[PDB]
Amino acid sequence: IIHLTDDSFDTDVLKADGAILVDFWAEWCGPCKMIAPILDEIADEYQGKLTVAKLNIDQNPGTAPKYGIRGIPTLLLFKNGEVAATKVGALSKGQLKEFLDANLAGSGSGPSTYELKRVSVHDPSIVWDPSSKTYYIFGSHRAAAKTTDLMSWTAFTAPWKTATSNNAANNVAFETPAVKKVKKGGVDVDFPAFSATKWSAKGGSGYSVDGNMWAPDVIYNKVLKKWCMYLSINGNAWYSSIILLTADNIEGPYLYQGPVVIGGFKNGTEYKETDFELVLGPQSSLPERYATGGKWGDRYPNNIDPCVFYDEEGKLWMTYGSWSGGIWMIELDENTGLRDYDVTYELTGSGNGITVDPYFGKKIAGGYYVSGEASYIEYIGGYYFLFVTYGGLAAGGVASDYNNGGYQMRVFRSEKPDGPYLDARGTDAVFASYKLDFGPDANDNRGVNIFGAYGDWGNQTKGKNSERSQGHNSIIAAEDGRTYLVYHTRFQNRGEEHEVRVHQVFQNEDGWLVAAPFEYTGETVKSADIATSQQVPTNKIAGSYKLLTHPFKLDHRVKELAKPVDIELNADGTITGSTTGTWSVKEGTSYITINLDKEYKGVIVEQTLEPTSDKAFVFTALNRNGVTIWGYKPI
Numbered sequence: 001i002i003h004l005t006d007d008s009f010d011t012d013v014l015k016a017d018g019a020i021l022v023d024f025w026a027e028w029c030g031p032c033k034m035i036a037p038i039l040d041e042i043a044d045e046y047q048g049k050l051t052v053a054k055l056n057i058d059q060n061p062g063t064a065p066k067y068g069i070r071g072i073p074t075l076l077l078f079k080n081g082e083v084a085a086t087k088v089g090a091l092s093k094g095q096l097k098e099f100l101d102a103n104l105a106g107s108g109s110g111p112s113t114y115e116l117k118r119v120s121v122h123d124p125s126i127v128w129d130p131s132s133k134t135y136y137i138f139g140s141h142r143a144a145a146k147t148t149d150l151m152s153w154t155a156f157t158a159p160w161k162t163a164t165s166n167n168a169a170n171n172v173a174f175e176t177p178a179v180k181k182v183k184k185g186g187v188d189v190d191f192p193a194f195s196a197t198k199w200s201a202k203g204g205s206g207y208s209v210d211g212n213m214w215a216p217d218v219i220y221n222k223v224l225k226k227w228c229m230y231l232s233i234n235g236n237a238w239y240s241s242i243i244l245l246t247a248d249n250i251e252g253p254y255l256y257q258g259p260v261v262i263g264g265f266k267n268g269t270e271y272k273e274t275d276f277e278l279v280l281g282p283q284s285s286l287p288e289r290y291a292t293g294g295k296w297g298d299r300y301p302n303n304i305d306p307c308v309f310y311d312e313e314g315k316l317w318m319t320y321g322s323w324s325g326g327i328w329m330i331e332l333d334e335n336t337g338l339r340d341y342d343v344t345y346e347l348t349g350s351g352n353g354i355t356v357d358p359y360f361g362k363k364i365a366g367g368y369y370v371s372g373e374a375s376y377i378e379y380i381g382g383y384y385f386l387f388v389t390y391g392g393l394a395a396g397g398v399a400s401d402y403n404n405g406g407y408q409m410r411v412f413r414s415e416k417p418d419g420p421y422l423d424a425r426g427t428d429a430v431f432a433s434y435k436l437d438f439g440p441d442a443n444d445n446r447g448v449n450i451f452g453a454y455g456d457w458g459n460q461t462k463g464k465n466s467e468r469s470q471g472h473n474s475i476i477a478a479e480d481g482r483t484y485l486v487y488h489t490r491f492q493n494r495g496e497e498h499e500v501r502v503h504q505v506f507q508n509e510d511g512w513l514v515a516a517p518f519e520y521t522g523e524t525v526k527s528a529d530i531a532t533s534q535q536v537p538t539n540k541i542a543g544s545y546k547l548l549t550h551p552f553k554l555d556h557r558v559k560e561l562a563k564p565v566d567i568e569l570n571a572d573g574t575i576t577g578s579t580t581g582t583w584s585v586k587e588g589t590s591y592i593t594i595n596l597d598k599e600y601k602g603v604i605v606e607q608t609l610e611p612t613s614d615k616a617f618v619f620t621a622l623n624r625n626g627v628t629i630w631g632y633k634p635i
Ligand code: NA
Pocket: 125, 215, 216, 217, 305, 306, 307, 374, 375, 376, 472, 473, 474
C-alpha cells in the first residue's frame, strides 16, 4: 500500500498507469480503522490489476476538497487520473470485491446484471403484446419464445384449434377454412374450401406438412381484436400458400381462417381450386402467362415468408416471396385480415418482365430467380425500410456448393409502403435480369449490407462462436422508443446450430439504418436521442479502436469471416494505424463521420460487451456503396 501525501498525489495518482484505489481517512474515525485491514488484504489479492493508496486527510488538507470528499473513509477509484467510481464507508471485504469486480475490466460475466438465455427459433418474427408488456417471436416449425427484456427468452408452443379440438394435429389444422364467404363489390361471394396441405401435396409424392410450416408473421388486427398468424405452408414445384390463422390470445390456440395467397397453379384447371377467380373473375382457361411449366420461378413467386404490417395511414399490406420471381406485395382487408378482393392490379410488363400481375400483385424486389427471401418492412424515422435476406440459410463451408450458406441481410428504403425500394445509391431492389447477387462470384451488389459474417469481435463473437449466415430478420420500432433488429444466426464451428440475436438500430444523419455492433444488453439510449444529444463527449473519443468492415462478396464456401484491424483515432481528427483517414463529429448530436478510402456516416454510442459488464464507445457507419463499418474502444 502506497501511503501518499498531497504533493505526491499528482504523480502517484493522476500520473498512474493502471487503476488506483484511494482511501481518504483520518485519525478520529472508527470506520477508517475497521477498513484498514480489509484494504491490506485487497492489496494482496488484487496485485495484478490495481494499486491501493491512502491519504491521511489530517496531514493533507489539500487533496480531498477537490474531489468533494465528505464522509470518511471515502474510497476513490482513479482511472489514469480521473474518478471512475466512488464509495463511502467501512465496506466489508465482500462489498469491496463486488465493487472492484464491477469497475475493473477483465472480470468476466460474474458482475454483469443481465442474463442472455438463448433460444433457437428459426426465422424469428417479433411482436409486442401490450396486455402483458411482453415481446414474442414466432418462427418456423412452430417454434415460439417470449421475453420481457430481449435478453432472456423462454420457448413455448402455441396450440392449433379446429372445430372439434383445442390442441389439433398439424395434419388436420389447415384443411377447412373457418371463413365461407368474403366481400367483393361489397356483396358476399363464396370463398374456396381450400385445404393448404392437399394443395402443397400436389408438388410431390408422400407429402407431410410437419417440416413445411415456415416463417409465420404474427400481428394484432385492430378491427377484429384478434392476434393473426400468417403462416407459409410450403410444397415443392411452387405449390405453396400463405394462410391466416387467428386467436383471442397471442399464445393460441390459433384457428385456420383461410388462404391469403396461393401459388403454383401452372397446370390445367387447378386454378379452380384456388381464389384465382375471386381475384380475376370467372376464367374459362388458365391465362397463358401462368402456363410456365418448370420455368415458373423466372416469373412468379414461391408463396412463402409473409410480412404483414399496417402502413402509416392504417392500411394493411402483405409482402411475400422467396427467390424465384421475387418479392411481391398485395393489399389486405383491414376488417378480415384476408386479401382485399376489391383491389385491382393492372398487368404491367410481359413474360419474365412482368412487374405487376393481376393475381400476385406488385413486385417490390428480386425477379429472374435471383436470391432474396424473408422480406420485411417497418416504418422507422420517416421512411419505410425493406429488408431482404440474400444467399443460402446453411452455415456454409462446402467448397463445391455455392448455395450452401451465404445468408446476409440487405436493406432498402422508400417514402411509400409499396415502393419503389431503393438502396443508398438509388438502385432498385427489383432486378431487370438474372444476376448472381451474393457471395464471392457476385456480379451485383445492391442494398445496404447491414452486417455480414464476422469474428474476433468483442467477448462473444469469437472462435467457434463467430457469427455467420445471419438473416431472416424482423425489426420493430418499439413502444419504448428503441428499434430492435431480431434475426437468427449460425456460427463458425457449431454445425448447423442457430440462435436468436437482437441488436439495437439507429439512423445516421442521412436517415439510413446503422446496427449497434453488439447485442442489446439494456442500454438506455433511445432512437430520438441520436439527433438531439451527444452520447459520447468529443474529448473522450480519441484512442485505440478495433475497426471491422463488412464487405460484399465474402466466400461462405470456405466460411470466410470479416475480422477487425487496429486503428487509432487521434484527438486532432486523424486516423492512423492499419489505415489512414480522418474522423469528425457533429457537436450536440451523436453523429460521426469516418473518412477512410471513402466517407462513412454513422453514430457513436456506449455499448456493453456481452456477456461481461465491460463498456465501450462504439461507432457504426455506412457508405452509399452499401458497405458498413463498426469500431470499438474499451472505455
Ligand atoms: Na419474415
